[PDB]
Amino acid sequence: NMMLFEVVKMGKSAMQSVVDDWIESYKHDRDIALLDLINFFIQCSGCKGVVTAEMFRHMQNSEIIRKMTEEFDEDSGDYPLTMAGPQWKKFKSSFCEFIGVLVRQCQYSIIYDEYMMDTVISLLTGLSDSQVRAFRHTSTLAAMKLMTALVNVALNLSINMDNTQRQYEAERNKANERLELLLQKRKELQENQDEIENMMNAIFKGVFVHRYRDAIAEIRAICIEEIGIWMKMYSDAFLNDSYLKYVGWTMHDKQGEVRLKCLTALQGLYYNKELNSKLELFTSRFKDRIVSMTLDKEYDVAVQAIKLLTLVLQSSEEVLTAEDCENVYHLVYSAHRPVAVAAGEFLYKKLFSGPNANLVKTLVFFFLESELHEHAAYLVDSMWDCATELLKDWECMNSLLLEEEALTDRQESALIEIMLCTIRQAAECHPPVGRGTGRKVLTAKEKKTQLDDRTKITELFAVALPQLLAKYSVDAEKVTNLLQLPQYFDLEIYTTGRLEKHLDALLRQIRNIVEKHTDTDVLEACSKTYHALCNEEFTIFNRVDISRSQLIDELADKFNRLLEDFLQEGEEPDEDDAYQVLSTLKRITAFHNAHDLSKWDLFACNYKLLKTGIENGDMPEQIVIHALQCTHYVILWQLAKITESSSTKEDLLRLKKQMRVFCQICQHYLTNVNTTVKEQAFTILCDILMIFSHQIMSGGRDMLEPLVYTPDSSLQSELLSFILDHVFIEQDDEDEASKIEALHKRRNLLAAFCKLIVYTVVEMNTAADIFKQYMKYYNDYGDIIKETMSKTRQIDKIQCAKTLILSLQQLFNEMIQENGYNFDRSSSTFSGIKELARRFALTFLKTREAIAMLHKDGIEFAFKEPNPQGESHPPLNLAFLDILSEFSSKLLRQDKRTVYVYLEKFMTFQMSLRREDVWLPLMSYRNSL
Amino acid sequence: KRKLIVDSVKELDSKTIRAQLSDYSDIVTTLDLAPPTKKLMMWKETGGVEKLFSLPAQPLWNNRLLKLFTRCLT
């Protein structure tokens, strides 16, 4: 009835209670009970029809199923097993538990009465042949959940017949009429076994072999999942090629959910860890497919292929080739962390199996042999979870770099990189960029371990870092990495530990590095390290403050001496002289970024340098770019100090002259022919122009009104001109890594200008020359332009729309200069302009005034220029109308006719009487309204 | 006509199954490597429109200065 199906969806019951209640009904009347059961399977398909006693007695299953299809009386296409929500997932569980419990509770008597099982198998083996998906998905599930129950029964039977065989041979070896009864029990049990096989052979041949190849993947995944279960539970009987092959073929299925269940089902046969010989022969045939699935289009399947392959390492034979293992190793560098750590486990097991000395060396050789990544951040992240024993053994690493086969230069360089990221990921207890999921909060145990490790690192390397620096003081790569540890130290340990001696040693090593190395990144680390250590809230400030002031005193005095001769009017300096000037300028520039060097007043020093490059045109580019940076930092650090209302009044006005003349200086160098000089002037200008924008005042900072600076038309054009010449360039359609880095540079420059657009330092009309590049440069700059389009729409939608049409007006104008006025409206170029307009249209409450103004402008632009030869002949730009009709879809009903009266002021009636080709723009626009 | 879902094709031809066995190129892909250079790593965290439109073009390494720029956002 409704009752038996209802009982199962919200049972909150021991399904054994339902089964046992049913079995008792079966004993009182078999046919009444079976009819309840037949119907139960039919309502589990959402059927709503009822099988009657009459049907049960005289109708074949084929006829019943047909009658149930007609009487299905569905409200929709859904059926129980396709509903969403936990409550319905619980129904599926209840559905499967009832089937399994029912069989198992009957396994000792009822199941052999040649009536129940056969009747259910028949209905289910025919509902699984139905074109009605509901009847087929549901019956196929039930059939597999019945087979697995009958696999359990045959297993018990096999167990009990072995026990019976044991007692029989026991009685014979050592009373005769017991031997007779024991053999009649062995006869009975074989008769039982044959009946269970017959049943199983009819749910396999009648359902499986026909539904593992269903078209509904959810029905194919059901079948593969459960064959895996049979081979796992009754390995002796089902784990052979005759059953494995179905998983072997179906892992070529084109649906990921099905491929997944194949791997799962095979993982279960390997987690057994019974080292099966027949499974070993299957995996030789399908080894190559399984390895390839590590790069399955679905990452979830790829994780399981890797994990299956790690369990294959237990296999007695060497089944995987060298090639296979190296393809897995590469995946430690994958973007998807689930894949990377699965490969990490593979790497760990296969190759990892002080004491850890050679373990560390092997990791270094692996990293060097894997020519895919230059850093080890991702390598470390891949093995944080498994090899945490090794990656945090800093005593072993520090000793490998000092205490005497040896380590090569490349190996010491890689060991420093590896060690650096292990320290990074331990201090900042989170993964590298691209491997994390939104920085989830840490366990109490995790936070403890963050503490435990940070003291270990600080204790050790506060002593050892001075030693490493001294040994590798000459290798840039090595020192650039080493100088970044301080940012993770625990500042209070430097005092509690009586370590002031090592800090002095460190500070001296840094100074000798500053004096010798010029690598822009070596010097960046030195400056950021000093900034990290110059925290006024820790006990070591005045110590590091003293060494810092000593360092700048040397550099500033040397800088004066150098400039007094470099700029002496007759001492035409050569390359050697220039490199000396550049080496000190770089050091001053790096430190002036992170540190307040206002006291040394370097503003005039660089001004004389820059104006000389203007007058003579002879100045090395590296000198110019770093003088540009240092001046930028000089100005900003003053702007930071003048915040104080308790401040000198002359200084603030003095600054306006420091900034105003700097803008014209940069504007001059923006026209220079050297590219890196242009880029540098452009970036500093876009930053300066934002820092000094009107928004400098908002947060109660009304003092700074005199500092506001607004650019000229000349400057705005020069800035835009740079974007056109350096950003929107010919495109292809030194290989990837470099070409990505080049793109990111151009994106920075593009974002720099767009910041000025969405913040109204420049007229919004400038954005037209950008907005017209949306589709042409979608992949490269699409996201930046869309953000500019969104921010501008929020500020000024009518001005946004006015600039959008201007973009299309310019695209139109470009085409007439290239193709000609008599262009083809079917051209691919004209096609793209109006599709660009169609996307523009979806960016449209106050949308009424904007779309209206857009048509007013687009109309003027169409009729702006008249024809040379004829008023009855067409205006020149009239074809623009068909572009503008891409917008009318968005227009309101009310203003469509108002726009027409406006259009009639422009169009004479002879024109509106025109229908010829050239005027097909008109009627197309007329059809719009 | 009926909302009841009826499938015209139940099984998948043996011929289509042998094709799946012989060509799985459409269900495997290339390694999507993670930033392979320290600079590309840095460009991922500072990349993206959100970070790009809220941070200076010329990096400022002291937050005493970086503020001076973020002050001026809306």
Binding site: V209, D241, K245, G248, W249, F282, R285, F286 | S14, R18
Partner: peptide, 11 residues
Amino acid sequence: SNDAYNFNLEE
């Protein structure tokens, strides 16, 4: 049996 898996002989 590697003739078992050969789907050219079907199931």
